[PDB]
Amino acid sequence: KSKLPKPVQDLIKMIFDVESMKKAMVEYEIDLQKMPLGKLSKRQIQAAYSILSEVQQAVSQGSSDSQILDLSNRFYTLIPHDFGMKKPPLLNNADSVQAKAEMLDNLLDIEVAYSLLRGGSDDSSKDPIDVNYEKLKTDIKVVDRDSEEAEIIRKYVKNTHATTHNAYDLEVIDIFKIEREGECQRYKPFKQLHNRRLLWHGSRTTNFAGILSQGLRIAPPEAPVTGYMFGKGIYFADMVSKSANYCHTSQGDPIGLILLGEVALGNMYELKHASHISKLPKGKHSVKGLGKTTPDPSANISLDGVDVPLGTGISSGVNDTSLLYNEYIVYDIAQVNLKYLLKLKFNFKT
Numbered sequence: 001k002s003k004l005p006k007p008v009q010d011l012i013k014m015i016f017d018v019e020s021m022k023k024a025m026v027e028y029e030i031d032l033q034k035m036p037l038g039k040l041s042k043r044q045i046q047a048a049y050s051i052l053s054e055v056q057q058a059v060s061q062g063s064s065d066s067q068i069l070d071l072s073n074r075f076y077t078l079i080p081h082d083f084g085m086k087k088p089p090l091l092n093n094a095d096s097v098q099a100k101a102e103m104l105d106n107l108l109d110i111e112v113a114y115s116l117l118r119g120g121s122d123d124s125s126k127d128p129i130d131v132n133y134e135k136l137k138t139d140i141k142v143v144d145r146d147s148e149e150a151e152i153i154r155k156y157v158k159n160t161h162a163t164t165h166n167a168y169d170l171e172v173i174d175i176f177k178i179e180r181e182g183e184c185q186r187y188k189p190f191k192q193l194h195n196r197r198l199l200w201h202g203s204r205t206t207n208f209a210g211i212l213s214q215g216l217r218i219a220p221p222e223a224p225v226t227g228y229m230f231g232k233g234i235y236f237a238d239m240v241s242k243s244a245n246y247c248h249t250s251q252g253d254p255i256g257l258i259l260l261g262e263v264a265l266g267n268m269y270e271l272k273h274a275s276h277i278s279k280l281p282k283g284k285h286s287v288k289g290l291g292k293t294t295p296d297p298s299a300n301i302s303l304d305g306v307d308v309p310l311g312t313g314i315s316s317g318v319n320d321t322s323l324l325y326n327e328y329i330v331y332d333i334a335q336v337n338l339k340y341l342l343k344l345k346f347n348f349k350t
């Protein structure tokens, strides 16, 4: 049996759960008989993205529902759905392409998780928790409850939960200090860049085996750039509740996972509305989606020379913006250095 700390053991079990991976596929209405977890491949996912891009071209160029029908069916051919003998819903709008682009992104992390678990060696004498921990190539340590870093992290959670996200409260169960193999060396050209912030990135439990082994990744080139508000980058938030909404927890599964990453923002390209960009303008290193609300800038604290925006939510002064809260997007995977992973219990008020 494993010598790993009990919170680390429970984390590994959580993220390598096969039935959670299956429950996530069922949520997307995928036919598991026509295509199980083991049939999932990058090749198929990329072909599905490419057809979604063709659907996107047909919708933006204003094709008829009779004309797009052919392209909508082509997607359902690559990613089988569970509708029985009924006709699938027509993908004739941007919301539909956005929803399908989002599902595919998630399937890309699920495929990594299942590949990791089904790859490798079988040894009965070794605890499967120890076996599955090594697959991640990440040093995972438990942060001491009474430490300074734990106090700062708990204040960030406590102070940046938005009023509009009050249908639930957050309880920090565990704090993990994480170190992905090779990530620190990848980050080096951006290590002393200006505008380095410790930001949130929430995701489903089924994404975290992929996130810890491959890191936060940008949607592939086949993916429709219009399926994402600020194009194809890595999205972060300064409001814990904005990111915790990406955990997709419920009364039937109230345990979520959220990251704290050091993001080299550099010169921010400030936007109030959707801009489906492929490349940043010269001199810019990130995109900042300007929210109506911002954590109080005079309340910013420093944790290992990185700015921590743990202030309470105040008005930014920004008018006529499409965002309630800020968002930060980087278009180079090297600009992210994962620092912490938090296990949270969501206490629903509904």
Ligand SMILES: CNC(=O)c1ccc(N2CCN(Cc3ccc4nc(C)c(=O)[nH]c4c3F)CC2)c(F)n1
Pocket: 105, 106, 108, 109, 200, 201, 202, 203, 204, 207, 217, 218, 219, 220, 235, 236, 237, 242, 243, 244, 246, 327
């Ligand atoms: C070659 N590419 C890959 O292998 C690959 C693997 C996974 C990918 N996804 C998984 C779904 N995820 C969803 C998502 C989106 C936005 C979020 N914005 C905030 C503030 C937050 O807090 N969370 C968010 C969020 F979770 C995005 C990244 C991906 F795009 N690509």
